[PDB]
């Protein structure tokens, strides 16, 4: 939903772990090689995401992963949002302020 | 990046950022392409311009408002692939 996507795709490790997971998709934790940042802190990220359905928890050959919830943000994260790469910046809300 | 996707994943913006790619015209020209009245459709643009997504031109005989950028008019126009998104009764929290 229009109030979940984008509060869990604006988010300064949540968008790092989207674009992460298209050449991830490995373990529980395997974004800390990824990021630098703990198997402790990337996975807090993770219980949002999951119920938010951005990302599906599976099992692979041995054990098991986190991949995007479809084709479709492997895609549209992808392409690139085009924004130069949204990341947290001291920018201001209102116009004319 | 915060204001960014608060301003593109909300109700009326949405519908804005794309109907101002099919259109560009005048201002509240944007009360044709949503069904929403010129004053209530223009409330949402003036967060919207100091988000940076949306900037004031002026054309042939008057003003205008347009996308930031080509940027935007392409993420938004190839589709964010979620089925367009919409205000919908989903939740949050995993495992939940
Ligand atoms: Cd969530
Ligand atoms: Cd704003």
């Known amino acids: 939903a ?3 996507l984008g509060r869990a795709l604006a988010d300064p490790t949540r968008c ?3 674009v992460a997971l298209l050449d991830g998709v490995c373990y529980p934790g ?3 090689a990824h990021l630098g940042l703990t198997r402790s802190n990337v996975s807090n990220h993770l219980s949002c995401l999951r119920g938010c359905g951005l ?3 599976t099992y692979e050959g041995r054990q098991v992963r986190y991949a995007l919830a ?3 943000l492997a895609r549209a994260l992808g392409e690139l949002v085009q924004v130069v790469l949204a990341v947290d910046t001291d ?3 209102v116009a004319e302020r």
């Open 91 to 93: 920018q201001p809300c």
């Open 55 to 57: 990302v599906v928890a």
């Open 70 to 72: 479809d084709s479709h």
């Open 2 to 4: 229009l109030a979940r």
């Open 16 to 18: 790092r772990i989207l």
């Open 30 to 32: 395997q974004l800390a």
